[PDB]
Amino acid sequence: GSMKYLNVLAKALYDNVAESPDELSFRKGDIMTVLERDTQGLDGWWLCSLHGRQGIVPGNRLKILVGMYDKKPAGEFIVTD
């Protein structure tokens, strides 16, 4: 239905440390779900979710992996045109 998320994940190829709580701290080998891309108007920065938080992550350090095919059916949203 309407208002569905991407529900694709990506594996970190490189590690980082986050200086802000709005930024995600991840390490190489870890996997996070990508919710949307270019989330701050910055090309290549994706809004990912990991460890109970969501935050900005440089997608240039991630590799997209389809880890889930089954997912919520969603669709619970108002009508839109």
List all residues 6 or more positions away from 50 whose beta carbon is below 8 Å from its beta carbon.
Answer: 24, 26, 30, 32, 33
For residue 15, what are its two tokens?
């590690």
* CA dihedral sign, ordered 1, 32, 38, 23: positive
Method: NMR
Q: Are 14 and 40 in contact (CB under 8 A)?
A: no
Q: Are 62 and 44 in contact (CB under 8 A)?
A: no
Q: What are the DSSP calls for 45-65, one per residue?
A: EEEEEETTEEEEEEGGGEEEE
- How far apart, in whole angstroms, are the C-alpha atoms of residue 68 and residue 15? 23
Q: Are 29 and 41 in contact (CB under 8 A)?
A: no
Number of domains the chain is built from: 1
Domain of residue 58 covers 1-81
- How far apart, in whole angstroms, are the C-alpha atoms of residue 47 and residue 27? 16
